[PDB]
Design a protein around this ligand. Structure first.
Ligand SMILES: *[C@@H]1O[C@H](CO)[C@@H](O)[C@H](O)[C@H]1NC(C)=O
Ligand SMILES: *[C@@H]1O[C@H](CO)[C@@H](O)[C@H](O)[C@H]1NC(C)=O
Ligand SMILES: *[C@@H]1O[C@H](CO)[C@@H](O)[C@H](O)[C@H]1NC(C)=O
Ligand SMILES: *[C@@H]1O[C@H](CO)[C@@H](O)[C@H](O)[C@H]1NC(C)=O
Ligand SMILES: *[C@@H]1O[C@H](CO)[C@@H](O)[C@H](O)[C@H]1NC(C)=O
Lengths: 297, 297, 49, 49
């Protein structure tokens, strides 16, 4: 059985503005001090990115559409965000990739899963010993047929019901092209929680998987913190920590990437944002002299 | 002027696994054309000696690559596609060819790079009363895109009369039984056809030829072969830093100037051997026959 | 521009001559060689003019 | 005629019944006769009776 979350407050999703974030290495080749130009799926600069927040008894695990691509960035302190579900039908009728990170081995498997209406992870604080354990793992029901499974090494993290300011910024990019699931990741320490900071942070590829299934919807997994001072029921005592993750969608875009001496991408420029940006794309330079130029037709 | 290479070196990965050709070719249960099966092969040395031997192989056609050279270069993600078609249809499974089976079933892209292997089956896939397990589609609203599959089972719509469940006039099921019999002619016998698709798709390479790897020699104009990359230049130790996922290097001209050794994971630079030019000066044939030689670079 | 013209396909399967030579047999290769030869020769003529 | 659905049998051999007005023919010939209910199968390509 799977317990169903109840008595959760629902709020409209807020909107915020991205600031030139989401540039990743598009190939395995190494280049230094070269103003290379590439054409691929990118998150356009200054885009309208939806912002979700979890915090009386406010909770949110909406089934957001996958679209062509997703830029998932979550700023967190207590690692309340654990994993993501990637499925089309999400009712054990079609393969549904399940990526979940827990105290046990990181589980990255694709199987037919009868996911319940509310797939929320649950971590309970025990009174016999002062330790946090994942007493609830009722996210799905059964897995009849498993085409492919990959179980990684176990990972241990400190899970606590803390409402303090987020300590780290984690950025992930998901793409499904040619039957390969590509994940790019970055980890940057941060203290300000007002909004995403400025600057360029290149995302290095993490892992590639040949899942070979087409995905139209995805859902984020949020842990529930239940201490010894809370009943621990889904009705009451399930108050989770402060959570904030941002979801953006990739589009076909042309970027001009700048490589420094060590091969890192310091800066980038869009080729469709502004006439000045288009001119800089045409001249293949970050500085434009006085004059008049022909960009396009 | 030119400098000639002295030695030749090969640096292939050390892989002991052997790809299971047995399942691909010698399979008791062999899939139908309506739902063709795809098999992924990786991380194994592939010996293609058996293939050009042509033992009981009716048709061995390779597009974009030569079978004799197949055991030299190095690939990634070998695909195997298995399906069963009638004896007079094997011709139409080829690049750039349109037919009843090709348009309504498994079809090949015009840019196909692989070998098509076909051998005749007499009675292994035939029944005295007619084998009806194998099915083919003779109706389809829109021609299939390359490498597509159809799992729908609906009555095809002809005319204004509704179909796909409303059986009636001008309502025909696209799927038909092939009806193979051993008493039929050679042109009506079932044939087992397997399609191999080859792609590099990235710097890393998984399936590589059984060629032995030799030692490494440096600071000499030699012929080097790194994972199927052929060139001629001196090899020296490189101070350039590669990020762990990166494997190659490129300059402004986009020619390779660095590469990582597969066996030892060491960064080494590549520099072309000096050529220059030759200019001969003469005081004049009348005065003397002595000359001086100037080498440009 | 002269150097950048060296990387174009001009209709061949690949720009690099070595990739064409290793992958394909001599009888099939020479057409792909001819495409590249014509393209590069035309580029040289334009530069010289 | 195809959409009329007033014909018990509407079969086109060698040409698409759905797309027939699209293709122009040099000469069109029509032969008319009335047969029994057990003889329609006899009047068919590849059918002898
Ligand atoms: C994002 O779109 C909403 C409407 O969907 C709009 O109200 C909001 O102003 C947009 N964001 C920005 C930064 O303008
Ligand atoms: C699992 O695979 C078997 C083997 O074909 C099949 O019989 C069964 O129906 C599959 N399970 C489901 C839920 O479709
Ligand atoms: C994606 O999967 C859904 C599953 O319902 C299917 O209907 C759709 O045709 C698929 N799209 C592609 C492009 O394969
Ligand atoms: C490259 O790395 C070296 C060593 O960490 C550092 O000294 C140098 O400043 C770096 N160059 C950059 C970041 O442009
Ligand atoms: C070489 O020089 C001498 C002296 O002027 C002249 O008589 C002779 O014809 C010359 N021969 C040639 C081949 O230039």
């Amino acid at each position: 059985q799977c317990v169903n979350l109840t008595t959760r407050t629902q709020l409209p999703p807020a909107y915020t503005n991205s600031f030139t974030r989401g540039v990743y290495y598009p190939d395995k080749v190494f280049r230094s001090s070269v103003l290379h130009s590439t054409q691929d799926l990118f998150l356009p600069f200054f885009s309208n990115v939806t912002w979700f927040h979890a915090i009386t008894k406010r909770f949110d695990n909406p089934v957001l559409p996958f679209n062509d691509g997703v830029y998932f960035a979550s700023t967190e302190k207590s690692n309340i965000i654990r994993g993501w579900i990637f499925g089309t039908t999400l009712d054990s009728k079609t393969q549904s990739l399940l990526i979940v990170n827990n105290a046990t081995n990181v589980v990255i498997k694709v199987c037919e899963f009868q996911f319940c209406n509310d797939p929320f992870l649950g971590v309970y604080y025990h009174k016999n010993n002062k330790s946090w354990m994942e007493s609830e793992f009722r996210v799905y029901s059964s897995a009849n047929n498993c085409t492919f499974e990959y179980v990684s090494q176990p990972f241990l993290m400190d899970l606590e019901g803390k409402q303090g300011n987020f300590k780290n910024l984690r950025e992930f990019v998901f793409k499904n092209i040619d039957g390969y699931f590509k994940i790019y990741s970055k980890h940057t320490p941060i203290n300000l929680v007002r909004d995403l900071p400025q600057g360029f942070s290149a995302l290095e590829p993490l892992v590639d998987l040949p899942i070979g299934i087409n995905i139209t919807r995805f859902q984020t997994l949020l842990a529930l913190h239940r201490s010894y001072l809370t009943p621990g029921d889904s009705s009451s005592g399930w108050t989770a920590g402060a959570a904030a993750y941002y979801v953006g969608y990739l589009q076909p875009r042309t970027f001009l990437l700048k490589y420094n001496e060590n091969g890192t991408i310091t800066d980038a420029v869009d080729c469709a944002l502004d006439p000045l940006s288009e001119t800089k794309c045409t001249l293949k330079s970050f500085t434009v002299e006085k004059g008049i130029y022909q960009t396009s037709n | 002027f030119r400098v000639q290479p002295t030695e030749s070196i090969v640096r292939f990965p050390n892989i002991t696994n052997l790809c299971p050709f047995g399942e691909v070719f010698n399979a008791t249960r062999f899939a139908s054309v309506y739902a063709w099966n795809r098999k992924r092969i990786s991380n194994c040395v592939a010996d293609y000696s058996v293939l050009y031997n042509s033992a009981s192989f009716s048709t061995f056609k390779c597009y974009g690559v030569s079978p004799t050279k197949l055991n030299d270069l190095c690939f990634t993600n070998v695909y195997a596609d298995s399906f069963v078609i009638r004896g007079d249809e094997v011709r139409q499974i080829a690049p750039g060819q349109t037919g009843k089976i090709a348009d309504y079933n498994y079809k090949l892209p015009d840019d196909f790079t692989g070998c098509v292997i076909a051998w005749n089956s007499n009675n292994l896939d035939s029944k005295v009363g007619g084998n009806y397990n194998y099915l083919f589609r003779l109706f389809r609203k829109s021609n299939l895109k390359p490498f597509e599959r159809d799992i729908s089972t609906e009555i095809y719509q002809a005319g204004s009369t509704p179909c796909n469940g409303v059986e009636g006039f001008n309502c025909y099921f696209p799927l038909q039984s092939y009806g193979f019999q051993p008493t039929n002619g050679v042109g009506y016998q079932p044939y087992r056809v397997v399609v191999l698709s080859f792609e590099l798709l990235h710097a890393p390479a998984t399936v590589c030829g059984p060629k032995k790897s030799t030692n490494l020699v440096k600071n000499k104009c030699v012929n080097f072969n790194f994972n199927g990359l052929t060139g001629t230049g001196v090899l020296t130790e490189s101070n350039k830093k590669f990020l762990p996922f990166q494997q190659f290097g490129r300059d402004i001209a986009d020619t390779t100037d660095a590469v990582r050794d597969p066996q030892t994971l060491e960064i080494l630079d590549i520099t072309p051997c000096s050529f220059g030019g030759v200019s001969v000066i003469t005081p004049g044939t009348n005065t003397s026959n002595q000359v001086a030689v100037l080498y440009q670079g | 521009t002269l150097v950048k013209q060296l990387s174009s396909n001009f209709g061949a399967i690949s720009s690099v001559l070595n990739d064409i030579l290793s992958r394909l047999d001599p009888p099939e290769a020479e057409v792909q060689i001819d495409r590249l030869i014509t393209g590069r020769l035309q580029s040289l003529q334009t530069y010289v003019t």
